[PDB]
Amino acid sequence: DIVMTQSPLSLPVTPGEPASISCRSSQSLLYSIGYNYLDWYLQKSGQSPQLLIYLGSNRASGVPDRFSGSGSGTDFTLKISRVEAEDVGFYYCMQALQTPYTFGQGTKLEIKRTVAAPSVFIFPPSDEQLKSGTASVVCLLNNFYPREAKVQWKVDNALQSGNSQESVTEQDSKDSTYSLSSTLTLSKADYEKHKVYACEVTQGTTSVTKSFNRGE
Amino acid sequence: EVQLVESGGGLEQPGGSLRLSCAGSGFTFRDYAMTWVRQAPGKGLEWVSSISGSGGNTYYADSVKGRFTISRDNSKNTLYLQMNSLRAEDTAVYYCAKDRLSITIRPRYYGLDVWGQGTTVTVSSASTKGPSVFPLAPCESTAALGCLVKDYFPEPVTVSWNSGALTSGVHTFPAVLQSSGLYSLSSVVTVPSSSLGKTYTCNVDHKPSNTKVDKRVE
Numbered sequence: 302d303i304v305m306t307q308s309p310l311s312l313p314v315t316p317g318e319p320a321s322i323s324c325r326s327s328q329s330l331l332y333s334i335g336y337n338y339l340d341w342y343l344q345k346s347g348q349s350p351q352l353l354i355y356l357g358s359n360r361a362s363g364v365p366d367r368f369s370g371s372g373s374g375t376d377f378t379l380k381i382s383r384v385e386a387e388d389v390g391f392y393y394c395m396q397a398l399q400t401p402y403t404f405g406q407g408t409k410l411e412i413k414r415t416v417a418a419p420s421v422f423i424f425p426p427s428d429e430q431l432k433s434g435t436a437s438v439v440c441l442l443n444n445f446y447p448r449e450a451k452v453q454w455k456v457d458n459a460l461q462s463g464n465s466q467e468s469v470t471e472q473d474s475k476d477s478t479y480s481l482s483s484t485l486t487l488s489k490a491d492y493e494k495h496k497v498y499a500c501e502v503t504q505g506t507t508s509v510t511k512s513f514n515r516g517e
Numbered sequence: 518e519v520q521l522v523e524s525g526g527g528l529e530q531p532g533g534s535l536r537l538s539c540a541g542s543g544f545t546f547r548d549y550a551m552t553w554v555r556q557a558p559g560k561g562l563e564w565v566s567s568i569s570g571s572g573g574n575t576y577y578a579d580s581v582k583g584r585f586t587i588s589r590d591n592s593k594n595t596l597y598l599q600m601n602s603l604r605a606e607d608t609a610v611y612y613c614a615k616d617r618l619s620i621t622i623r624p625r626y627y628g629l630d631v632w633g634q635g636t637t638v639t640v641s642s643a644s645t646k647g648p649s650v651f652p653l654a655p656c657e658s659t660a661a662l663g664c665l666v667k668d669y670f671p672e673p674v675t676v677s678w679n680s681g682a683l684t685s686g687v688h689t690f691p692a693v694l695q696s697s698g699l700y701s702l703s704s705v706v707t708v709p710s711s712s713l714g715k716t717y718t719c720n721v722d723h724k725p726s727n728t729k730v731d732k733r734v735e
Contacts (some may be wrong), residue, residue, distance in 0.1 A: 340628045342562075349612055349635055350554070350562065355628025362630065393562055397626060400576040402552070402564035420707075422661040424653040430667075439653055441661055441705055443688070466693040466701075482690040482703045484665070513656035 303328045303396050307405035315413045316477075320381040322408045324394035329374045330357075338398035341370055341379045344407075345390040346471035353392075354379060386412055389472045412477040416505075419445035419481070423500050423511040426492065436492035440500035440511070442481040444473070452483045455499040455510075461485060519543045519631045521613050526636030528645050528671050528725045533603045539596040539613030539633050547571070547591040550616035552629060553598050555609035558672070565611070566598065570619035580606070603640045610635040639671040639725070646670045646699060647726035650719070652734040653705065662734045663705035664719035668697070669726070676704040677720045 304327040314320045322341075330338045337357035342350040352361040354370035357377065367382045381388060389412050394405040419442035426436040440452055448469060454461035467483035483500065492515070499512040525537040539551070553565040566587040567576040575587050586599040596613055614629035646669050653663030666674050676689045689704040704719055721730040 338626070342629070344562075349632040350614075350629075351632065352628045352630050355630075356626065359628075361628055395562070395629075397628075400564070400567060401578050402554075402567075404562045404564070407561045420659075420661075422655070422705075424661075424663070425656045427651040427654075427665075430649075430651045430665075433649070437651070437665055437667065437701075439663070439665060439703060441663070441688075441703075443661065443705075443707065466695065468691040468693055470688055470690060480688045480690070480705075482688075482705070484693070484701060484703070486695075517656060 302401055303330075303399060303403050305394055305396060305403050305405040307392075307394060307408050309408060310406060311409045311411065313411040313413050314384040316386060317383050320384050320388075320410060322379045322392055322394075324372075324377045324379070324405050326375045326377075326396055328398075330377075330396050330398050331374050332398060337373055337377070338396055339370075339372070339377050340395045340397060341368075342393045342395060343388075343390050344393065345474065348390075350393065384410070384412070386477050387474045388412075389474060389477065412472055414446050414477040417444060417446040417478055418504060418507060419443055419450065419502055419509070421500065421502050421509050421511045423498065423513055425498070425513055425515070431489050431492070434489045436487045436489055438485040438487070438492075438498050440483045440485075440502075442483075442502055444476060444478040444480055445504065446478050448479050449504075450481065451503040452481070453501040453503065454483070454485045455497075455501060456485075456487075457495045457497050458499075519615065521615065521631055521633035523611070523613055523633040523636040526611065526638050526724065528639045528641060529603050530642055531603060531605060531640055533640070535600045535603065535638060537598040537600065537611055537636055537638070539598075541594045541596070541615070544615070546589075546594040548618060548620050550619050550624060551589060551596045552614045552616045553587065553596075554612045554614055554629075556612070557606075557609045563609075567616060568596070570624075600638065603638075605640050607638060608640050610637050637673055637724075641671065643670055643698065645726045647728040648674060648721060648723050648730060650721050650730040650732045652732060653703065654734055658710055659707050660710040660713060661705055661707050662717050663703055664721065664732050664734065666702040666704070666721050668695075668699045668701065669723055670699050671725055672700060673724075674700075674702055675722045676702070678704075678706055679716075679718055680720060683717070
């Protein structure tokens with residue numbers, strides 16, 4: 302099988318600046334003059350892959366002028382002349398010279414924007430869930446940058462660990478921010494034994510705590 | 518518009534079977550070679566199989582040989598992948614893709630120009646579990662609302678808001694795998710607080726359990 306290797310694997314870029322992704326094949330992809338059987342694909346978060354470049358250098362339908370492909374034989378390059386927010390996602394090269402078609406590992410294009418503070422929201426467990434004997438308390442961190450932020454759960458001012466899980470969205474195609482959701486899981490009995498539920502969000506010099514009282 | 522619509526994914530036991538479909542519209546189906554590509558959870562893209570325009574030639578990844586069969590019904594504009602002797606390694610989103618134009622003796626390649634939306638195959642001995650959908654509501658001028666989609670198996674769950682009419686400011690988060698082996702996911706939206714007294718409904722689809730839940734968030 303033909304092996305495809307991409308470099309780099311992660312690419313952080315400031316909007317407006319150029320980006321370059323290398324793809325190298327283990328065997329020549331030049332079938333004949335002008336026919337390098339090498340494609341480039343973008344996969345945006347939660348979407349199907351989409352064609353950018355085919356046969357080494359040809360822009361596909363609807364692909365902006367900012368995208369170009371070059372190279373021959375074993376060495377290929379995708380260039381984005383000016384990176385825009387909507388370019389965020391994973392970039393894959395693929396050879397179509399021989400079966401099996403083979404892909405590069407993927408390059409994650411990240412967008413380097415200004416620091417944005419999250420909008421923080423806390424949600425109590427629903428009355429409906431409490432009937433099942435479990436309480437999920439949810440904290441939302443909305444539209445922040447950079448990715449690095451810490452959630453600290455507090456129950457009657459006592460620090461919590463090992464009873465929460467969180468996940469983070471991929472970079473937003475419009476504003477280049479992340480969002481985070483954290484769930485604190487307690488038994489109904491433990492939940493009803495305490496009053497103040499607090500989610501503390503730390504980002505650099507700022508900590509923001511949103512809270513609720515169970516009785517209220 | 519040239520479009521590919523997929524179906525047939527689900528949860529199966531090891532050694533089980535499943536058939537995937539990929540229906541084409543807005544183009545002459547028989548004029549094009551067709552291709553299956555898969556993506557394992559958190560992984561890259563892997564080629565599975567290709568078929569010529571007529572169906573006369575078929576091509577397979579070594580790991581699926583003797584197990585998978587690619588076929589097509591050109592009168593029905595449909596590409597198939599018969600998946601027998603299913604293995605845990607087959608767990609993936611499966612995409613179909615439009616391949617080389619095949620109305621000349623030698624086909625002409627223009628990339629994999631159109632892709633289907635994907636269909637998910639999960640291979641596990643674990644039973645399916647439908648989700649329990651709970652409201653996320655506060656206990657300011659902008660309010661957040663949401664739904665917590667708890668204790669389901671397997672992935673995936675899709676969430677829309679107001680039957681797809683509400684899209685701006687929607688964040689549907691990656692699921693977490695709980696210690697129970699069940700997934701939990703949240704979906705949120707930010708709305709004006711002034712009009713809370715407007716209806717907001719999350720629409721939660723879980724294909725493997727044949728379950729759709731609509732939850733009005735008060």
